[PDB]
Design an enzyme around this catalytic site. Sequence first.
Site, PDB file in Angstrom:
ATOM      1  N   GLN A   1      73.900 -34.439 -55.756  1.00 44.97           N
ATOM      2  CA  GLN A   1      74.496 -33.159 -55.387  1.00 44.97           C
ATOM      3  C   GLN A   1      74.998 -32.365 -56.556  1.00 44.97           C
ATOM      4  O   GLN A   1      75.513 -32.912 -57.508  1.00 44.97           O
ATOM      5  CB  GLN A   1      75.629 -33.365 -54.374  1.00 44.97           C
ATOM      6  CG  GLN A   1      76.178 -32.100 -53.724  1.00 44.97           C
ATOM      7  CD  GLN A   1      76.617 -32.304 -52.283  1.00 44.97           C
ATOM      8  OE1 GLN A   1      76.487 -33.386 -51.733  1.00 44.97           O
ATOM      9  NE2 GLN A   1      77.136 -31.256 -51.670  1.00 44.97           N
TER      10      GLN A   1
ATOM     11  N   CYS B   1      76.220 -31.588 -48.402  1.00 45.69           N
ATOM     12  CA  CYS B   1      76.303 -33.019 -48.280  1.00 45.69           C
ATOM     13  C   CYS B   1      75.435 -33.565 -47.154  1.00 45.69           C
ATOM     14  O   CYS B   1      74.784 -34.584 -47.295  1.00 45.69           O
ATOM     15  CB  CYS B   1      77.767 -33.372 -48.029  1.00 45.69           C
ATOM     16  SG  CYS B   1      78.558 -32.244 -46.862  1.00 45.69           S
TER      17      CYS B   1
ATOM     18  N   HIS C   1      82.593 -35.970 -45.497  1.00 45.72           N
ATOM     19  CA  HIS C   1      81.476 -35.908 -46.402  1.00 45.72           C
ATOM     20  C   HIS C   1      80.545 -36.985 -45.947  1.00 45.72           C
ATOM     21  O   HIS C   1      80.944 -38.124 -45.827  1.00 45.72           O
ATOM     22  CB  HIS C   1      81.966 -36.197 -47.793  1.00 45.72           C
ATOM     23  CG  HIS C   1      80.895 -36.627 -48.726  1.00 45.72           C
ATOM     24  ND1 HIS C   1      80.314 -35.769 -49.629  1.00 45.72           N
ATOM     25  CD2 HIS C   1      80.312 -37.829 -48.916  1.00 45.72           C
ATOM     26  CE1 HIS C   1      79.408 -36.422 -50.328  1.00 45.72           C
ATOM     27  NE2 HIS C   1      79.386 -37.675 -49.914  1.00 45.72           N
TER      28      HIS C   1
ATOM     29  N   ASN D   1      76.617 -42.534 -51.320  1.00 48.06           N
ATOM     30  CA  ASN D   1      77.200 -41.204 -51.476  1.00 48.06           C
ATOM     31  C   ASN D   1      76.211 -40.285 -52.175  1.00 48.06           C
ATOM     32  O   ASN D   1      75.865 -40.517 -53.330  1.00 48.06           O
ATOM     33  CB  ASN D   1      78.500 -41.317 -52.282  1.00 48.06           C
ATOM     34  CG  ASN D   1      79.188 -39.982 -52.500  1.00 48.06           C
ATOM     35  OD1 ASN D   1      78.654 -38.923 -52.205  1.00 48.06           O
ATOM     36  ND2 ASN D   1      80.391 -40.031 -53.054  1.00 48.06           N
TER      37      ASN D   1
ATOM     38  N   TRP E   1      76.631 -38.008 -53.837  1.00 44.76           N
ATOM     39  CA  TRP E   1      77.180 -37.441 -55.066  1.00 44.76           C
ATOM     40  C   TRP E   1      76.654 -38.297 -56.153  1.00 44.76           C
ATOM     41  O   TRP E   1      76.586 -37.927 -57.316  1.00 44.76           O
ATOM     42  CB  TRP E   1      78.696 -37.500 -55.095  1.00 44.76           C
ATOM     43  CG  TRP E   1      79.344 -36.405 -54.379  1.00 44.76           C
ATOM     44  CD1 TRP E   1      78.744 -35.423 -53.665  1.00 44.76           C
ATOM     45  CD2 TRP E   1      80.740 -36.199 -54.252  1.00 44.76           C
ATOM     46  NE1 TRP E   1      79.672 -34.595 -53.125  1.00 44.76           N
ATOM     47  CE2 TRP E   1      80.912 -35.046 -53.469  1.00 44.76           C
ATOM     48  CE3 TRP E   1      81.865 -36.856 -54.743  1.00 44.76           C
ATOM     49  CZ2 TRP E   1      82.169 -34.542 -53.154  1.00 44.76           C
ATOM     50  CZ3 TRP E   1      83.105 -36.351 -54.446  1.00 44.76           C
ATOM     51  CH2 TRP E   1      83.252 -35.209 -53.649  1.00 44.76           C
TER      52      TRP E   1
END
Length: 307
Positions: free
Chosen positions: A67, A73, A224, A248, A250
């Site tokens: 990301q 997300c 998230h 995740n 991220w």
Amino acid sequence: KEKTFEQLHKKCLEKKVLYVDPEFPPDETSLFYSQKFPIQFVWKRPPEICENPRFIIDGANRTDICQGELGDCWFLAAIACLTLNQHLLFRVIPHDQSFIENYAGIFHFQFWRYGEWVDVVIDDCLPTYNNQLVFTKSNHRNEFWSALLEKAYAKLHGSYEALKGGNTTEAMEDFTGGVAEFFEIRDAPSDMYKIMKKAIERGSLMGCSIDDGTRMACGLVRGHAYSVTGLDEVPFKGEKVKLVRLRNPWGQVEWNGSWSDRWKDWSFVDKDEKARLQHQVTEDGEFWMSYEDFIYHFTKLEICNLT
Ligand SMILES: [Ca+2]
Ligand SMILES: [Ca+2]
């Protein structure tokens, strides 16, 4: 205007010109509709960004999804899930695309919309700052499939800004044409581990989230979305322990509790299991946790069951 991918590419190749998309042009209109992004972005094609750009390197897989400074997300948590089912992935991403062969600054993807596969055509201009991508990127500096896919989906929604909110199940259905189901964890029956397990192997996509009504002490992030990427049992200290693996999007922050990367009791396991569970101390955004802690912390579980 209103021409197929097929022709359009050929046209650009014969005119020896790089494609520019009339309907989704490289300017501020494609970025936002209401709220302006404060830093001024430069649009650049991947050949302008680096020496040797590539569409996909060593497979399209979940480590290619990281990301950016966008809040999409939900969408990524779905792409990551999709890479767990490779054959399904190639319906969304046409594989015969390149930067070294017949390159004309034009690429395309497929989404499931209103009961049918539809194709999306886009130019390869991407938003950057200091000659680096601002939005989703691959962890490998030369991979651009994921950055381009995002752009295509942004076009489908009219702007990058339009992605700021959403539900994973929307993207899952857009990638598979399957049927979404939700579980609220308490109202989930006692055999949920088994239900999740059946779903995974069937190749069905699974996301989860912690309700909003590091971010938390424990390494998790609220409101998230997360990708569910594995379920397994390990024999540990004479007893079999049910585990859940999560990612995740991220790709940077993970759980720090039991069964996390740096957990010391990893010592009481044999090579086999560890090898089998692909256990690695890597700040990749992926981690194992106990089934018990999973059920305890997470509040929503979404499954898209294949059609
Ligand atoms: Ca890769
Ligand atoms: Ca890890």
